[PDB]
Symmetry: D2
Subunit: 121 residues, 4 copies
């Protein structure tokens, strides 16, 4: 089975570590991003999420939220934990990066989208 537990790196140079996944699918971790949309100094940030455990898939879906500690933003990631053709694990994910806006009239411009592919560190 593909398991989220462990250390990962992505295509932008960010790393994350995820701890034990419990019987309800819950996990916590830490994220160190290589990139930011702000001109703020990056700091390591917690993440929390779940793996879907329905039918106990060898390649489960999952999602997590990175609670950025150096900005007012939040990012969520979701994807699937695959075994690729080489037998290596790969997380294929898409994310939404939510920026803080001061006024609800600017809400429309607050959400960026993209992908990340993670492999084991």
């Amino acid at each position: 089975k593909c398991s989220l537990t462990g250390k990962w790196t992505n295509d932008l140079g960010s790393n994350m570590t995820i701890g034990a996944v419990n019987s309800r699918g819950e996990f916590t971790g830490t994220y160190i991003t290589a990139v930011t949309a702000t001109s703020n100094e990056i700091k390591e940030s917690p993440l929390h999420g779940t793996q879907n455990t329905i039918n106990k898939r060898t390649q489960p879906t999952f999602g997590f939220t990175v609670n950025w500690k150096f900005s007012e933003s939040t990012t969520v990631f979701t994807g699937q934990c695959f075994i690729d053709r080489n037998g290596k694990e790969v997380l294929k994910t898409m994310w939404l990066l939510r920026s803080s806006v001061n006024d609800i009239g600017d809400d429309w411009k607050a959400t960026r989208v993209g992908i990340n592919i993670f492999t084991r560190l």
Copy 2:
């Protein structure tokens, strides 16, 4: 005035969710009761877990959460901001990604749907 995630919410598709207390680290848990599904499965209350961003203790914080669906193999994530709207109402403006399970990594490209949800207090 502050916008708080804790409590009961309903959305523009008829779904409800309950969010519990937000701890000092911004963490919260809740339950999601969806009105709609992409599958032909029975909907069932599913847990959610997420965080509110506490940097600068904003009155209108950003947040994100994951719904761990219990009636399908999918996962949805939501992120958005807890606003005080012009009328003084608390409103969650969110966008989501719904990740379906695929069997072959070759089909990964078609596995993610996107959309919005707007939540107000029940």
Copy 3:
């Protein structure tokens, strides 16, 4: 049938006019946005797109590109032309707003996403 031709307004206060849709599904129009992510002065911008004509649906899908004339950005919209429960036409759309970045290393942050609902003006 729901037809894209005509004048529309959206939930953010933007308007657009779309001309005749030809037999291949092609149309052109003009977009006047009520909002921008830049601090530039908005100007009316051309759009070009297509309606899908397969099976000649009464509620077709469609897409179009707004070629912004007051910024370096581009937005694309896609959605479906519905008749709602009142018999009114509504365009339900989602969009990607692509900003220009100077360097490919910043590509990850260049795409915003959102929705717009259009009704007839």
Copy 4:
């Protein structure tokens, strides 16, 4: 050095596209030959139409286009930027929305998929 959309491109999913000349208004037409589909229909060459942004005559312009699929009722839009990569190669970095047709406006929420494509010259 300029990145130009005109010519033949291939993507990370195996799809190809041909883009014709870009006129003074930034307009172009082309053909898309997709390797993948969300339906169980036969893929068939489909037309595309879009624009390149010409403001400030950037060497690495943004652009967008719509693929008018001819073998399904769906539409896809792409937007991105025509870059000169660090190795001097022209690369289209794009994101897309794939809109499926639904019969009932009530199902609109599940009709839009999202993803990326990276194109290089064939």
